[PDB]
Design a binder for this molecule. Structure first.
Ligand SMILES: *[C@@H]1O[C@H](CO)[C@@H](O[C@@H]2O[C@H](CO)[C@@H](O)[C@H](O)[C@H]2NC(C)=O)[C@H](O[C@@H]2O[C@@H](C)[C@@H](O)[C@@H](O)[C@@H]2O)[C@H]1NC(C)=O
Ligand SMILES: *[C@@H]1O[C@H](CO)[C@@H](O[C@@H]2O[C@H](CO)[C@@H](O)[C@H](O)[C@H]2NC(C)=O)[C@H](O[C@@H]2O[C@@H](C)[C@@H](O)[C@@H](O)[C@@H]2O)[C@H]1NC(C)=O
Ligand SMILES: *[C@@H]1O[C@H](CO)[C@@H](O)[C@H](O[C@@H]2O[C@@H](C)[C@@H](O)[C@@H](O)[C@@H]2O)[C@H]1NC(C)=O
Ligand SMILES: OC[C@H]1O[C@H](O[C@@H]2[C@H](O)[C@@H](O)[C@@H](O)O[C@@H]2CO)[C@H](O)[C@@H](O)[C@H]1O
Ligand SMILES: OC[C@H]1O[C@H](O[C@@H]2[C@H](O)[C@@H](O)[C@@H](O)O[C@@H]2CO)[C@H](O)[C@@H](O)[C@H]1O
Ligand SMILES: *[C@@H]1O[C@H](CO)[C@@H](O)[C@H](O)[C@H]1NC(C)=O
Ligand SMILES: [Ca+2]
Ligand SMILES: [Ca+2]
Ligand SMILES: [Mn+2]
Ligand SMILES: [Mn+2]
Lengths: 237, 237
């Protein structure tokens, strides 16, 4: 049972994508997770993009767990250096049919009033009380307080290539971050037992957020654009 | 005791390196592991390059294991497409003071008549009976029969960037392969317990080999050049 899809670009009204909140697809085919008006990103924005169909990461009958690989390109343009850009974007897996969570440092995937489990890879740009120096790549399991973290230097407005791979047999989740214009390579890995944290069927997608109003800083913002994306998952079941 | 060295280039007569067999440093400063005469690589060649000093990967007193990161660039130029280039190059960790092993598919690190333990990351270009499709990246533990394998497409004569990282706490060895001219990214990871396979002190280095005479193919060859190399290890004990 192999499931896969590929988007070299994004078209408006794409039937295989579920856009939520501020998420929208632009004319020039880029997936803009957070709000951008007249070429300028605003604060108080939150958006998600889910692959319309659910994917099966494990089977209770056989006990088998799926292995998967996903690649995508994103771009984060930080127009206002001071006081501080916010908040970042993440790739995530969660139960099907969830709603957008809290914005800000929660990226729109965590909802304290009705927490739902999730596994996510974050590209954190703002330093919250629970964060190490930013920007950083982080592996999140049911929480925004990463299990593993690695710092990286952003290529403002540049293109970033990401490769995320999950090995069911070793339970290793390894992500690679590359900024082709700078030739920089960042790597991070950790052990995650999907069968233990998530249900058999899940949704895969992205979520991002800009500065929260409570910070009283309209400059706390940046873009969170997804340029392309492919996914592939295999269940030996 | 954090140890680390960096070679942005290679100088003739490098006090820091132990060259063995066919390994040499060229005029333009590249480390040529295997023989190349008048701009053409030959068969029946084997060479290794070890960092002169030994590194401590674990301490029996505290039981602690080191974490390390190594980056290097290499180039493999395959002049003769048919019938099949050979054999590839590896980055390895072995007990100090070892001797070059068998050539060919053994890369010069395995010696059947007196086997010594080793951990190595291979960039295999020839398909032996025990191999999957080539080229492929492979993680080798005391054997040339990889524990994990991933296929990749070579950039003939192009430059390749490699990042190898080892996490003592998770025991995850993850390697990343990038061909900047093509923008391709390959990743592979596995669990390796250094403390269980290697002695407290080891040598780190490279080894490569071209076609073995027994194959009767002089075209079974390619270059195995190392352009730069940085290493860093951190033992908490
Ligand atoms: C939010 O971003 C604005 C645009 O970058 C900041 O204003 C810019 O500040 C520059 C100083 O670094 C100045 O040279 C630019 O002319 C100015 N750009 C414009 C058209 O506003 C702004 O900084 C605040 O406001 C400016 C006008 C000054 O009063 C600064 O002292 C302020 O810090 C940023 N706002 C905040 C709260 O940082
Ligand atoms: C070993 O590599 C050689 C160079 O790549 C091969 O010879 C070249 O073969 C070309 C056609 O494949 C031909 O156009 C070239 O002129 C020739 N190069 C020269 C001038 O030597 C060689 O191929 C075999 O041997 C040559 C001499 C020819 O007889 C070919 O027809 C043979 O396939 C490669 N060896 C083998 C056996 O693959
Ligand atoms: C492979 O390289 C070795 C050097 O390490 C050479 O000795 C081999 O040459 C062959 O074997 C030697 C012992 C001698 O008989 C010589 O005449 C042979 O050519 C070389 N093998 C080949 C086939 O070139
Ligand atoms: O300003 C952007 C920022 O707003 C929120 O954080 C603020 C404040 O900036 C922070 O330092 C701390 O004191 O928490 C405040 C909110 O209670 C938001 O949580 C954060 O993610 C970011 O959007
Ligand atoms: O020709 C290069 C090749 O030689 C050796 O392999 C030969 C033969 O080419 C191969 O197909 C198989 O039959 O094994 C033979 C040796 O027993 C060598 O092992 C291989 O690594 C490469 O050098
Ligand atoms: C933030 O956005 C929400 C809806 O997205 C809106 O109700 C709220 O008033 C906004 N707050 C500010 C400060 O604009
Ligand atoms: Ca944060
Ligand atoms: Ca081989
Ligand atoms: Mn974080
Ligand atoms: Mn192999």
């Amino acid at each position: 049972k192999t499931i896969s899809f590929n988007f070299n670009q994004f078209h408006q009204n794409e039937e295989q994508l579920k856009l939520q909140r501020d998420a929208r697809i632009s004319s020039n085919s880029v997936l803009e997770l957070t709000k951008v008006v007249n070429g300028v990103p605003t604060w108080n924005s939150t958006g998600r993009a889910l692959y319309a169909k659910p994917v099966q990461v494990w089977d209770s009958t056989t006990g088998n767990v799926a292995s998967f690989e996903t690649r995508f390109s994103f771009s984060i343009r930080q127009p206002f250096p001071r006081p501080h850009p916010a908040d970042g974007l993440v790739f995530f897996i969660a139960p099907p049919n969830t709603q957008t969570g809290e914005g800000g440092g929660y990226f729109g995937i965590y909802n304290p009033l009705s927490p739902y489990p999730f596994v996510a890879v974050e590209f954190d740009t703002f330093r919250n009380t629970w964060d190490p120096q930013i920007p950083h790549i982080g592996i999140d399991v049911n929480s925004v307080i990463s299990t593993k973290t690695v710092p990286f230097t952003l290529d403002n407005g540049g293109i970033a290539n990401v490769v995320i791979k999950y090995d069911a047999s070793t339970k290793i989740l390894h992500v690679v971050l590359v900024f082709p214009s700078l030739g920089t390579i960042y790597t991070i890995a950790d052990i995650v037992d999907l069968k233990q944290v998530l249900p058999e069927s899940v949704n895969v997608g992205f979520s991002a957020a800009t500065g929260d109003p409570s910070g009283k800083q309209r400059n706390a913002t940046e873009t969170h654009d997804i340029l392309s994306w492919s996914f592939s998952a295999s269940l030996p079941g």
